[PDB]
Amino acid sequence: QLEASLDALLNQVADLKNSLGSFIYKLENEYDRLTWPSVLDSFALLSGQLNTLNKVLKHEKTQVIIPLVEDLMRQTEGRVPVFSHEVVPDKPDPEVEEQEKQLTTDAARIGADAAQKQIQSLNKMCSNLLEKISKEERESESGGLRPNKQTFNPGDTNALVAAVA
């Protein structure tokens, strides 16, 4: 059941990592060029892959992992379950610890009824208003059919041109 979604997420993460590594190795040169040759494209690809992985993980399930009992055969070669059993536990998270501490300090820095809950509600209301305004603007701008210019009309004057008559 969930194995399908697990394999899908694993393939997505592997493709993202492979694309990132290929872009890095192709544009390393021991130093990056300050002209954005492909940095924007790599950033867009990474952001899209991350958003796709997050949406797949949050959509639905379309735990515990014991030792080993052919992508995985290349890494876990020779049928070594001890490697998978020892690499599964191996996070310090030094900056994440400070972030969690600063968050759990107050999480709103002021007020109780006007805390992160009411702030998020007001932000969602403002975002809904902005999205409605943007949708109205897009529906208004979608009316543009084509830049219908105008020029001479030689089709009539040709037959209407002078002659022996």
Binding site: S47, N54, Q99, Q120, S134
Partner: protein, 66 residues
């Protein structure tokens, strides 16, 4: 080499880039999601998606300006 067709292609590319920049701006404005929808892993996945969307919107704005 096809000066008129080259100018038409340049105009089409400029219009497509402008439309893509506008669509990226609209998507970044609509993907705010102030509601705490991240329930599986909030502190990790929420911040990850937020930073990714911010970097993507900044890159899209810079590319559109250029």
């Amino acid at each position: 080499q096809s000066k008129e067709t080259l100018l038409q292609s340049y105009n089409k590319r400029l219009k497509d880039d402008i439309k893509s920049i506008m669509d990226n701006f609209t998507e970044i404005i609509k993907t705010a999601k102030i509601e705490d929808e991240t329930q599986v892993s909030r502190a990790t996945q929420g911040e990850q998606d937020n930073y990714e969307m911010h970097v993507r919107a900044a890159n899209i704005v810079r590319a559109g300006e250029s």
